[PDB]
Design a protein around this ligand. Structure first.
Ligand SMILES: [Ca+2]
Ligand SMILES: [Ca+2]
Ligand SMILES: [Zn+2]
Ligand SMILES: [Zn+2]
Ligand SMILES: [Zn+2]
Ligand SMILES: [Zn+2]
Ligand SMILES: [Zn+2]
Lengths: 9, 202
């Protein structure tokens, strides 16, 4: 999977 | 548990360059090593309240488990060529005369008549299955005039692939050394990360 950029600081 | 990039064998996963995983075949790669960095989250992701979204590599998007035009290995992560064939990202990076169409997405790969004329031309000195030692294309050790030859993915397995840092300003930053000329410390951690990549995927 790939962490959403909305969940990245 | 630890995520390792199957192109560069690095283990750093920051918010800018994350190590991601294909949800069908299982390969793990830096966003930046595969051209999927700085892209917007998928439309399917709005359905989730979770922090992560599914992702699939290009081979799985097309429903193939391909072979590489440049080596006999079946593992690792692939990009499609302009002719509808497939090459490892790592082979495309290290083989001379092979270039990416656009550097940002690393897509597609255009292989030339010159690339194909090198097929079988050198025997890979690291193939474990000699039935394939003369398939694909070998690179050589980059130390002086050393003429030791190997497939890019066979050299990767032995921890022989190196990349110069950006600050070093070397026009071609991808290079390889045979075991006789390699940096012993570098081989060690690359071989260690390679073996962890094999145990994680399986
Ligand atoms: Ca290249
Ligand atoms: Ca090179
Ligand atoms: Zn990487
Ligand atoms: Zn995949
Ligand atoms: Zn390959
Ligand atoms: Zn080989
Ligand atoms: Zn050498």
């Amino acid at each position: 999977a790939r962490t959403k950029q909305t969940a990245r600081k | 548990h630890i995520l390792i990039c199957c192109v560069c064998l690095g283990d750093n996963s920051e918010d800018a360059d994350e190590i991601i995983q294909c949800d069908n075949c299982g390969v793990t790669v830096h966003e930046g090593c595969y051209g999927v960095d700085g892209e917007s989250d998928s439309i399917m992701s709005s359905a989730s309240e979770n922090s992560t979204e599914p992702w699939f590599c290009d081979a799985c998007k097309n429903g193939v488990s391909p072979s590489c035009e440049l080596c006999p290995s079946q593992d690792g992560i692939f990009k499609e060529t302009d002719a509808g064939r497939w090459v490892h990202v790592v082979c495309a990076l290290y083989v001379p005369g092979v270039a990416f169409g656009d550097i940002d997405k690393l897509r597609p790969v255009t292989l030339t008549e010159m690339n194909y004329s090198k097929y079988g031309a050198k025997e890979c000195s690291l193939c474990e299955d000699t039935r394939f030692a003369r398939t694909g294309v070998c690179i050589s050790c980059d130390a002086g005039m050393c003429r030791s030859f190997f497939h890019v993915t066979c050299a990767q397995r032995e921890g022989l692939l190196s990349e110069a840092a950006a600050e070093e300003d070397i026009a071609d930053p991808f290079f390889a050394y045979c075991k006789q000329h390699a940096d012993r410390f570098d081989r060690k951690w690359k071989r260690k990360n390679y073996l962890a990549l094999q145990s994680y995927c399986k």
